[model samples]
Target: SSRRKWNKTGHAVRAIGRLSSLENVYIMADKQKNGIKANFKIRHNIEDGGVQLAYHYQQNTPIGDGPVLLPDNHYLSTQSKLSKDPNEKRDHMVLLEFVTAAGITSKGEELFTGVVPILVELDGDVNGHKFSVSGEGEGDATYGKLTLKFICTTGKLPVPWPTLVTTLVQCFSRYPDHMKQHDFFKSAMPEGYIQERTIFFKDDGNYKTRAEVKFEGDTLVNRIELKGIDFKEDGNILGHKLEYNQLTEEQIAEFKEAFSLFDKDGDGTITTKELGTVMRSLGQNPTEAELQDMINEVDADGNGTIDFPEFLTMMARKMSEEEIREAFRVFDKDGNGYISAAELRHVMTNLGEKLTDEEVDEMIREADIDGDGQVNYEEFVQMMT
Candidate 1:
């Protein structure tokens, strides 16, 4: 409800082995606390139009013969405790997965086509919503269209932690509305690539978005895009643009300002001293505490000051892909992608002259879409369009 910053956690699981022949496509869930409990059917509409559900079940437990399985390697022919070891330790938190039924095969060898769309009846606490992770792929060379979504909602519903019920869309819509995600996933899975792997991860559809999980020697990279989220009020997205997290031009400008504040010289190159001076200006006496906070950010030699490289880092770290591109374009008046002091002022201020500090911070906040203290590409594009 009140400007909750992003919350992020990640995992590294090498899904073991391929789907068994009898396992056309089955699902599995991790055995951690609320990590997993059960999965709902990915109802497939039969050719004639009837709905054929997978994994049939009894009262609360899965039936002896069901179409779907909890996250497991063996097609869930039956159910009980998840592990066969009887003593197999269940995780405090768990995740579910699927495998091809009996004789089917995936377009790829791996199942998490992009970050699969999973519907949870979490602890049977379905608040009529489901959560989703953008497409997640296996091993090297990430390949898939990143699954994305957006939305508008009211109230202060928390993202179901132990049990996540959300849509694949970044907007995090509740059901009936979010059902669109199921259709969307069906479409994405067949297009030579699945979107699940490439999807961005947003927890509970509220705060902290995570994605780009990189494999040690594998290709997965966990990434985070904290943009276009509204924490200003509880469900106050009426005026919020639903371009998802895509930053616009004005937003990008704000991000550029954050960069510039760190840049200090407007020459495009920052020094350790500049990093300190800009944030903790001395005359009009700013504190050494704040100065140290800003300065230590640049100094690399464990020294108290930084030079060009430090400044360069100051420039690079503040903005996201959405904002960085525009800022680069803003400073590189010649469209070269490299900046010149003369060029920087030309495009940013349109006169290469000067502007007030208020103007600068205002610009930064305007672009700080995710309010992660920086501007992104969406903000950049919004500025121009």
Candidate 2:
């Protein structure tokens, strides 16, 4: 039963270390102690599956008879999932490789190596435990001793807010247009004595039907409050609003075409492997680590894949200046150099935003730099930004 239970449940194995003490480790005679540093290649060896190893190389880690202090910026952390049967022939383990470094070298020389068996009891939770490290090679030869922390927990790691928001926004974008306008959607709006009700969009699910949003409070305490949507309180609401509003139809189409080109499998999501292939075809070579970082930069949902919405959001962020130009052109519909008050009223009304003549005048008064009752390209850019 215990063996069966072990195979059924997953375990999170983590190793975190900011510093480690090295003692009796031999160094080359010509190497200066102050200039010496250590490079670590830590591998998580799974008996049943393969996982990427952790590489932590720290320079300026001076060596001494006491603790070898790694630079302040260097920290070693690695996590992997493990599952196994008790009767399995091979056991899960961690491989630690220590390489000695001098001033400069094309490659490092291996000095000491050891393996630590991962032996956590089934259904057991361990936190911040100090694991034992013993040398593997010649019994008479002394390699050295190391101290590191280990964690073997029963559940999966927690997802961060950035990742969750990415997933939620993408999910919300898929809802039908009519469903978006339902009162349930308006539940996110904060309820207080209202000051003004502005509809940003209508019949457009692209922005999650973020219409009828209202703001309250006087000038000194003005803010957009909400109750339903789980947006963080750290001013992320404005950031998301900007991202949604900035994406134009043409840019969205371009993003779609670019995404499909890299998706290859037509799965509507681009994986790390697909992105690597596309990047290589463009004559740029990136390592697996670099490719993973690229995916992580825009993989808001943290699903290890890039969906269409995430791709579009990333592209929109990159094209901020271009978006401003596109926005200005939208308002300057007459192909003239300036946006007249009439053009502003026309554009706003068509976008489902209600604006009286007085409101239009106030808006123009705020952004019209020359006070010519019109806005030029520079003024429009300033207002949009």
Candidate 3:
């Protein structure tokens, strides 16, 4: 009877030991297309300690050069129940397919197509890991490379919020000119600032008003506190309320260059004649009346000519509008001019935060103000601001 009871017991259950969370995945192409987009098809055996398994997916928009930023919120839960021997090595493999699209299509063309196999060791050190691989498309042509970072641990981790360092790096990557005036200080700093609303840089010990940020609520900046810079009173920079004070040194330099290009006579101001030449240079044939109207719109002093300050304000407003449109395009995904609930769900779930269906629905309900069940460009801009 004792021997029968021992046989019935068999072996004790092994505890789950590893949870690998994907932190970041960046794909850089050898050559960039006009309008490029990335699609990811990821397959893995990651699951809970039980018998069920699930898959993950993601998508992203590429900047000018070709660096594609993948979603950061995917977690792979693994267990040690595959084998009876606890000392034996346990390895999990993830398969990925990197696809690209030049323009909108039902099925986008696959520029760089291949299966990348990633191996995760369950008993390895919990420090983290980085994997880099090259992608090969048809005819064995190498198109680009992919870099991914993962954090491995035994316990569940919180969602990785966007940090100043990461945001600065992304901003610089998006606008390479921004790097000329800012230096990344990789030291300890205070937190609780939103990434999109905040801008970080090394103070050059100059008390210039160019680095000021204007917002409605109480603002907390990095390093020091600013005084007398109210968002309502001193808000408008050069007669424009479009946050020109947030412009970096390099951005200001760009505006100066543009102004100089238009001011051909070196008179420190742009007249209708200079505007006509600039327009024709860009292959735009504007009438005399149109040029006059353009000059009058930005000629703040009623002086039929645009000075440096006025030109800067016009350029700043134009840049902000373009940025908002670009952001909306990134989220629209299908070029449908509206963001659907499925798109929101895809992004929210992949953020690795493990958001439930109800939470995602709540977000959609708040953003979809028009009762259309989708977010249009106007609604997206409203939500962002």
Candidate 4:
């Protein structure tokens, strides 16, 4: 009940972007049309009910169609219009709101949630394209508060000019941890808007922007300063430049070390199998078909498999349409348009619920094809269809 209340009060790990291996995090900003594209790769040591395991990592991937479950029992929701581009110019910016039941930090304990990757057009073009990634989250309790910001970009540019700006951030009254930042803002607010605007927007080039930071009370407390912003490939800009790759040298080393695990093999590339393995190892229970679907969607070589470069192009995400439809079909055993009440009770049960006859009838009506007040196999699947 306390965990659920934590969910209610917005205190627990409502959204986990990284954990213990915060040092093993890498964020880069690759070049795009108008600006740079941001991307990130983080390796966190997962602990389920105090059971610690080796580090697991998540890089940039497409969005998931089905459920994005978090180990803390919260869902890593799938945003329909999440940003997709190396630049992350236009898309819904999701802020992480931490939900800690207690302000006390759980030593070494952590959770993992997935964010969808973005595809950016060069100069916002529908044709020429590049790669990047982005994510943001926050939470607070009676004793203290927490907020996390993450991004990763890639390109030929030495400096990643593009940024995943976290417009929302908390301003704590006092400095908390050595790993945190306390800062003064241009304005006065609780969770003030801290804009990480991409600097030196450019075109026809290669570079990246990898940066991060956390501030309390409008003062710099803990910061992942934007050093990547200074890379030769990218130019500088005005305002506060974030420190990229600030997750710590130790953390970066771990991620680089595990890059092979992400590669899924010692091979230079990552195949669908390797990518899927990474997801599963992180406790991602994607269906067999659901997992394979990622290969079908991201594999560009037509080799019926995904390579490391190809894996780098995608991974860390999936399409949602298929998984939802598949759920409908899985229960439509008869291959008819409608599914009987007996069928969907299972899905409902997965959500931990007992269906009433009226509830089942209503579901059938919504999923029914002919609206004949009854559902057929085809009609049943059509609801998700």
Candidate 5:
């Protein structure tokens, strides 16, 4: 069947540095001296449907321990050398490859199968440490092809950034139309937000199509130029485009106004209840523990409430060790050790924050240390803590 072929082609991709695969996986550079070691072994399940894939990874570090699920495909993972070696760095990486079926249907409608999604997880100190995960995917279709690249970085954060990221992402997932029109997405964005975009499509009966966009602040610094095509005259391929970068001036006002509405006290702070209300309004009912978790992301003044800036931080990102693992569980919606752009968007929206596509793209760029397109468990913790 096509399924076997689907998995077959993907089996040949090289293991990206830092990311180990269950099959012919890559090895870390000087593992023993790097103070990090990763073991990769593929586990197969066969019953005539071909082979189902599963793999195991183990890291030795002093950050803390127990179990963690590595990103890519979900699987139980662990770290066992950290606590004994406090001086060692708890840095590592992961890589994955998969396939999808895609095509323009007989009726000319877009059609594609959902490939296995990616998730990431990481725990330990957020200083002088690093971790990254990268993935490659291909489509098993005659008419089209798709490839995904992801990256996430971990380290000390500007401030605790979490709830808002989750909440914003959640609302976008749950009430996209409603969330899309809001001021926050249109304007309210963290400082230093930068983005770049790239797109690929078929043109002139040939598919050498690529479109790219880059920006700093709200200004557009680069874009593609095209002229003449059989389907249209001088129209760029709309389907394949990459966009990234900072927010606009008008957008900044929107975020402030949006935040003000939630500041019930007008004291420049948002209480835990207000945060809850934001989540509940988006149809995401937050548990008490969850509320506390979001609050913990910020509330650094020890006032037990997240100030406007702190609130912004929560709406952005956060991290820990045992604390980090807990945070991973919160961000890893599907129990996978990785977080995709969609998942990150869910987090931002769930926190009652709305962000533009470029803003989301910027978020990934900022935290994706290794240049992969997604955030892994390790990068997640490092980005926030």
Candidate 6:
């Protein structure tokens, strides 16, 4: 599309949530839109070991760009980027994940463990191509060894929302066993977690990327090594790294307005039965199992409910265990699993200088769970969690 700094609506959701493949299709359309001969329709046929999807350029149709159609079809690639094998995996595809680390600490940290020693494997051949996200305890790790398969198609296709959702549902339709075996119910449900989480990927097959998510206090930190570039003396990732945080106040207000609508009872918590009401707003008909998974995942301190914090976590996505811990660790200077005034002063100090007792005392007064001057881990974690 035309590069215009001045934009609206599309910018906010442009780079988040949706899969990169979906976005790539739209980008392809914008670039190829201008020179249209019209007569664009989707066509698929049994070929190789699978179905072949391509654009049927016909005459007598209205002038238009060949818009990318659903279920993965090639609208571009007249210049010959389409692979020799119709069933080959996409060159541009990477086994993907979206994750967030709330209160997490350190990089390359294993987020959770599982029982029953169950393995969650993905193995399917729809048309002719096959794919998999295999391993035991897959979601337990902040980073899974993303299986890199070969080229299915060179051209990217824009999958429609309905089809995309169905395809995703189909992908995980058979995972009920693993979910239960892994005690996934104890952790946040995979459905919501996958939907709204940070994105991560590696190019080559299962190589340790050395990439990590770090935090210097509440500020998320990322480290990048440059071979040709010289390192700056100041230890700042100011212009380099990216981080995700909670909803903005304005966004929260917007959310509250919508949430208040579903929260018709005004009890401040959405009941399991009322979940479908909220899901309807998003055009979702979540299965009963899905609903139960969510309740088992988000219900805090039992009692079977979804409160504002639970909703926030579901909306914003669950961060990795380390992310949650690291978020706390930033406040815990002595790493004593506590945030006392002394620790706060040491952390807030400049080099060798110390923070004033008044400042530290004020912080303790704000975050301390009890009247005590020290802030326990739970109290400190509450600031964000």
Go through the candidates in order and give each one's C-alpha lDDT: 0.30, 0.37, 0.35, 0.34, 0.36, 0.34
- Worst lDDT window (10 residues) for model 2? 104-113
Over 331-371, each residue of candidate 2 has an lDDT whose tens digit, in order, gives 77776889888988977665435789999999999998898
Most TM-score-accurate candidate = 4
lDDT of 4 at 65: 27
Evaluate residue 120 in candidate 3 and report its C-alpha lDDT on the 0 to 100 scale: 19
TM-score for predicted model 5 compared with the true structure: 0.25
Backbone clashes in candidate 6 total: 22
Measured by lDDT, the strongest candidate is 2
Q: State the lDDT of candidate 5 residue by residue for 1-385, as single tens digits.
A: 9998877666645334225432332222222322222334432323333332223232222112222212122121111010112352432212111211111011111111222222222221122223232222222111111222322344332111210011000000111111122211112121111111111123311111111222223321212222212322332212211111122334434655767767755544566788788767555688989888777666443435554434443444444357777766666688777777888788777765679789998999888888778888778878966
Report the Cα lDDT for residue 265, model 3. 60
Rate residue 208 of model 2 by lDDT: 16
Give the per-residue Cα lDDT of candidate 4 at 93.
Answer: 34
TM-score attained by model 6? 0.22
Candidate 4 local lDDT, 1-385, one digit each (tens)? 8887777666435434233322221222222211112222222112222211112111221122222111111111011112223564443232222211111122111111112122221211101333343334433221122334334334322222223232222222111222121112111222222223232333222223222222343233222222222322222222213232213324433544445555533433345566666655443567778767877687433434443323333433445566656655665556575566776665455333567878977887676657676555455445543
Tell me the alpha-carbon RMSD of every candidate.
22.3, 29.6, 28.6, 21.6, 26.6, 22.2
TM-score of each: 0.19, 0.25, 0.22, 0.29, 0.25, 0.22
Kindly give the stretch of ten consecutive residues in candidate 4 with the minimal lDDT sum. Answer: 72-81
> lDDT tens digits, residues 275-326, model 1?
5554333113356676666666654333233333333335444424556574
TM-score for candidate 4: 0.29
